[PDB]
Write an enzyme that holds these catalytic residues in place. Sequence first.
Site, PDB file in Angstrom:
ATOM      1  N   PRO A   1       0.827  -1.212   0.000  1.00  0.00           N
ATOM      2  CA  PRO A   1       0.000   0.000   0.000  1.00  0.00           C
ATOM      3  C   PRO A   1       0.856   1.255   0.000  1.00  0.00           C
ATOM      4  O   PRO A   1       0.382   2.324  -0.383  1.00  0.00           O
ATOM      5  CB  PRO A   1      -0.765  -0.088   1.329  1.00  0.00           C
ATOM      6  N   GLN A   2       2.104   1.123   0.434  1.00  0.00           N
ATOM      7  CA  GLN A   2       3.007   2.263   0.530  1.00  0.00           C
ATOM      8  C   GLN A   2       3.729   2.522  -0.783  1.00  0.00           C
ATOM      9  O   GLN A   2       4.680   3.304  -0.837  1.00  0.00           O
ATOM     10  CB  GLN A   2       4.012   2.056   1.666  1.00  0.00           C
TER      11      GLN A   2
ATOM     12  N   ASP B   1       2.907  -8.139 -11.673  1.00  0.00           N
ATOM     13  CA  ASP B   1       3.245  -8.326 -13.078  1.00  0.00           C
ATOM     14  C   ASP B   1       2.922  -7.090 -13.923  1.00  0.00           C
ATOM     15  O   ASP B   1       3.631  -6.777 -14.877  1.00  0.00           O
ATOM     16  CB  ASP B   1       2.547  -9.570 -13.629  1.00  0.00           C
TER      17      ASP B   1
ATOM     18  N   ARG C   1      -7.193  -9.833 -14.602  1.00  0.00           N
ATOM     19  CA  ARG C   1      -7.147  -8.699 -15.460  1.00  0.00           C
ATOM     20  C   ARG C   1      -6.144  -7.801 -14.794  1.00  0.00           C
ATOM     21  O   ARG C   1      -6.180  -7.504 -13.605  1.00  0.00           O
ATOM     22  CB  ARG C   1      -8.505  -8.028 -15.554  1.00  0.00           C
TER      23      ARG C   1
HETATM   24  O1  LIG Z   1       4.870 -18.055 -11.363  1.00  0.00           O
HETATM   25  P1  LIG Z   1       4.075 -18.799 -10.130  1.00  0.00           P
HETATM   26  O2  LIG Z   1       4.795 -18.395  -8.705  1.00  0.00           O
HETATM   27  O3  LIG Z   1       4.145 -20.252 -10.315  1.00  0.00           O
HETATM   28  O4  LIG Z   1       2.503 -18.282 -10.092  1.00  0.00           O
HETATM   29  C1  LIG Z   1       1.680 -18.297 -11.232  1.00  0.00           C
HETATM   30  C2  LIG Z   1       0.498 -17.345 -10.987  1.00  0.00           C
HETATM   31  O5  LIG Z   1       0.909 -15.930 -11.055  1.00  0.00           O
HETATM   32  C3  LIG Z   1       0.457 -15.212 -12.296  1.00  0.00           C
HETATM   33  O6  LIG Z   1       1.747 -15.550 -12.855  1.00  0.00           O
HETATM   34  C4  LIG Z   1       0.246 -13.980 -11.366  1.00  0.00           C
HETATM   35  O7  LIG Z   1       1.476 -13.585 -10.848  1.00  0.00           O
HETATM   36  C5  LIG Z   1      -0.742 -16.125 -12.592  1.00  0.00           C
HETATM   37  O8  LIG Z   1      -1.495 -15.881 -13.735  1.00  0.00           O
HETATM   38  C6  LIG Z   1      -0.556 -17.490 -12.054  1.00  0.00           C
HETATM   39  O9  LIG Z   1      -1.506 -18.522 -12.119  1.00  0.00           O
END
Ligand SMILES: O=P(O)(O)OC[C@H]1O[C@](O)(CO)[C@@H](O)[C@@H]1O
Lengths: 309, 303, 309, 309
Positions: free
Chosen positions: A227-228, A256, A293
Amino acid sequence: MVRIYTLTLAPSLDSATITPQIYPEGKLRCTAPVFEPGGGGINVARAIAHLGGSATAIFPAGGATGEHLVSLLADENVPVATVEAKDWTRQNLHVHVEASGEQYRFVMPGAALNEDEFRQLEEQVLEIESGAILVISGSLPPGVKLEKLTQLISAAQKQGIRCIVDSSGEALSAALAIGNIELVKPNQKELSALVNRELTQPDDVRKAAQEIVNSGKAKRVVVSLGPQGALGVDSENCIQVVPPPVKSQSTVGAGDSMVGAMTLKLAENASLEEMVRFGVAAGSAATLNQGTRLCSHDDTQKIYAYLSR
Amino acid sequence: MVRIYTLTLAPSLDSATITPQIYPEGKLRCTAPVFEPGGGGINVARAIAHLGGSATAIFPAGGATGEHLVSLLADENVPVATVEAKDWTRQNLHVHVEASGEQYRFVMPGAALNEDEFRQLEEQVLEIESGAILVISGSLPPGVKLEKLTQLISAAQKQGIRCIVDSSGEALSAALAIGNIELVKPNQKELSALVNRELTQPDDVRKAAQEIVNSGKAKRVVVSLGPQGALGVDSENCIQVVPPPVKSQSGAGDSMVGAMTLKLAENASLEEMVRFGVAAGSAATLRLCSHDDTQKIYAYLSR
Amino acid sequence: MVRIYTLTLAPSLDSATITPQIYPEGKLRCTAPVFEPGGGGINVARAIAHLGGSATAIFPAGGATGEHLVSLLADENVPVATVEAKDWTRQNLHVHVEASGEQYRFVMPGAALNEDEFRQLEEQVLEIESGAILVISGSLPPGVKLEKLTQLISAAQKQGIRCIVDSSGEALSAALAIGNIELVKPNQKELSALVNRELTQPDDVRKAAQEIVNSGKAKRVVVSLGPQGALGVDSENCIQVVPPPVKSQSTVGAGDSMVGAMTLKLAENASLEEMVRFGVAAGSAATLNQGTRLCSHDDTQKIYAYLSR
Amino acid sequence: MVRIYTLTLAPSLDSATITPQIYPEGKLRCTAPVFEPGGGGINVARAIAHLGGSATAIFPAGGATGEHLVSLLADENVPVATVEAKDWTRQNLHVHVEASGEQYRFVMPGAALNEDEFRQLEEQVLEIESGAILVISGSLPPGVKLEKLTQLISAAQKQGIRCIVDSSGEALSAALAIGNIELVKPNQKELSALVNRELTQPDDVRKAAQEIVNSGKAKRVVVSLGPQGALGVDSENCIQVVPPPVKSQSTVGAGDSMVGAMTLKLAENASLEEMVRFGVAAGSAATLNQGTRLCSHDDTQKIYAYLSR
Ligand SMILES: O=P(O)(O)OC[C@H]1O[C@](O)(CO)[C@@H](O)[C@@H]1O
Ligand SMILES: O=P(O)(O)OC[C@H]1O[C@@](O)(CO)[C@@H](O)[C@@H]1O
Ligand SMILES: O=P(O)(O)OC[C@H]1O[C@@](O)(CO)[C@@H](O)[C@@H]1O
Ligand SMILES: O=P(O)(O)OC[C@H]1O[C@](O)(CO)[C@@H](O)[C@@H]1O
């Protein structure tokens, strides 16, 4: 503006569903699942597309889930470069609970990758042109040794590919050990795990981040602070950006989206401050939508103009 | 520094306990409770005391729980001015759960106050000299109509008393209606309620705060934003302060008000007031703010 | 009918309150508390009063909370015999949450009991006439050693006092080692510990209870089975009584209400089946309310008539 | 013994996974899913096989998930009669949390059926011989109206097919409206809705069940009462059966197993007493096992032998 690629060693066909509430034992009635292309590098590439840029997502696809994933990226006009894999692309379930507004994320293991499939992925990565940017994002799939990822990064840097790493703590540490990583984005827990100390004093986070840059491990470190907002440092500047006091629908795609936004600015050779502000704008924009999304162009633009006042 | 007073219409004898886990129906074994003074204005007075200031807490004390409360503040060297009340001072329960590290806060209603006890409290307030600061903080107990609080603010202002109000809902709206409130500290929800609209746009919080100031209802509005710090506005300036990225557990609101009140007593700038308030709020979340913790954070913010 | 007494070494002034929902960190707004006299033996005596019987509650009372506790028992027509105690009677909080309909119960340690205060309580007990029934119920307070409780039971039995014990597992095992306990009410977990073996086959609970009776440790064993009611055994008979298919709002008061009902029946020299049926009727009636109100006369009579069909 | 068939208009490929913790927002690391056949009627046929009988599962199967479901039933040696469907068989998620031992069940909507697929399913049903038993169990897929279900039942009944229906709500009420349902198994809440009044008094459940039977809407009503067992009535008798004080760990699979057991008893022209006891035995045997496991022959027989003493 230079070309952007992402590498997702463990893609996911995400299914998002909604259910009134969450409790043990009873059948929780969920809505028909909405399918979305998932996995770290893939989400990074989708965010960049949403923001009006382009990034080519490199990843293994297997089985019908794989084909489903690829088909969805086509719809979203995200360029891909795929490798055929024997093991089926995994499916992760995201459950939004209406009563609480909470979201739960059930993350299965990435599909296995055999040595031959990894080689093909490496092949695709090393066809990347010098000076382009490669974002390696997401977990390491079963079958992949840490050393192989490390060697791949070294080889990539050897031919001028500029690498961004957003992954597990082990991959993070190993990547920083190679050094000259263009950008990393640890959260506070990850930063603490990185430098093996509690960050309790007001200046501790900045000092830890600056130390990582100064030792040449990474050129830029943007610490995610929830939040920061975010605190970013490079060799010359340091900036903390705090998101505006807006809604808060689904916290999941913030990371992401932030990496995508920052990579986009990095590609455009923007300032550290533009990069960090655009990253926080996008991460914040993402929280306005459902988890799967990512940030939308209009929301990102509006928050960014505000943050940039 | 002008003199500082606080008023707590609904004090509390706070009890704190610890238990292994929290689940329904079963008997949850709790450690022997630990007691400390509670209530908005009282906590404000305590924070100020930790920070090296002096504030006199005015409040009703009733029964053995009230006597406990008064004795606790005696041991803490916090100056008080009490009115003896019939209804026994409430006792709230704070439960720390070991398994999760979570805290649960059970807040009963303030003890009832009859007309005669309110009268005594009000006269205590009107004993305050012109130019002094009065912080009215905490919920409103039963048997207290908004009009009574309102007429108390007006009476206080008429004779030069500088009024800070930290409450919620109607009490806060009621106070702002009288206007010329030195300072209020709503959170985003309360702010949204005060102006009767959803605050969803980036600039919405600042605009709503500014609207309140421009109307003359308050001289200063400091919006509490939880982990994001605070956004402060006055007739001339706007300041947003985020805490350092240090650790959290939560007594932030009362500490922040205490800190900002001290600063106002010292005629501080808006910037100094908000920074010190954020420093104290943060210190409390590392229990109220300690002096060293608050100073350490304030120094960093004030670099 | 012989006279009934109860002993509560750890009384509680219960406060019952309501709040819309329960979540951490936030201030949970609760209604003005409602106060009830509480603690094991005290609840037993209250249940007996509700059911038209009379049982004198013997207990330590300290401070204003102790006075309040005493005042409330007067209002419920429960005769008392109190000992003044230095430490203040404890206050337990029972919170009913509207949104979920569940209760959360915060139980503090019983008030400390001095040796002199325990002596005064023991003196009250040893004035009970031969042939009378004493129910010892509830947890042990700090300052009371288990061996003191067993010595009291021995002294009681020595002068013809018929002792019922309902307490912790350790207290339970202790009383049973003394033996000749009129009645005990272990749950399945406790029963399994008592006989030191897993109860996994259909007949295991019954055999375990019978074993306790056959050893002379207890004259009657009534195993509480939650929703499945109770399984009672003496030297000659065995009966399981299941509660009617109605909604249960709570279960805290069930235990003490059941013991009260069974004690009353024992004082009336009722049969085993009458005793167990009345106990389950009273327990079931208690579960109809949110907790501290215990079994009502009408609910119990209605349920008892139903069960006795 | 008459032949037994089941119908599952909404089958499921049940996936199960394990994760250490459950909390919002964070990525919950789950294990590679394990799979089992799912859907009401399918589980009924599976329980029946465990109990030594034979029931053919009639159901739609679509996509690779449908193939996976069929393969798993083959692995269990359960006879099936499938219809190839265009929409992919749903995949539900069962999550077991290690920190707490709790389980969470995410139940997706059934895959849709088109005109042709539903016609083929009906044709399979109407090939069932007169006097045989058909169990229609589970949710209705979106797109399949109640009228379609009731038309199917009316048709089946016309040629002497004996119909048992386990569904909820509107589907159960609709089926009962057609009348002459051989057996229904509502829980208390469902039963309360069926008769449109709150069942608060001790004898209310029995009365409500008897009303449904007396109206001719169902020949038998067995009310499942959770841990308290079941109360069954027909036009002549009433019996309530409570299971033995065995250890319960997971309630899932209790309902379907219970239906399977009572259907087997019905196929053997069993007494009401035998049918309800065997249903409770099977329900109880299923809950002996952790997870989603159904009743076993040996556990069920052991409990039934006890109940039938
Ligand atoms: O890369 P990880 O740690 O296996 O997690 C995958 C999950 O994270 C996303 O990559 C969100 O960060 C997703 O769509 C997904 O299901
Ligand atoms: O005797 P314990 O185990 O300390 O618990 C006391 C609590 O239970 C009752 O004794 C219910 O059994 C209460 O009224 C009470 O507050
Ligand atoms: O028929 P419903 O209500 O959609 O529930 C389906 C779920 O229940 C079972 O049918 C258990 O009853 C499962 O195998 C499954 O996933
Ligand atoms: O003024 P309120 O809203 O009734 O809250 C009282 C609670 O808050 C404090 O005033 C903390 O803000 C406490 O010590 C206390 O028990």
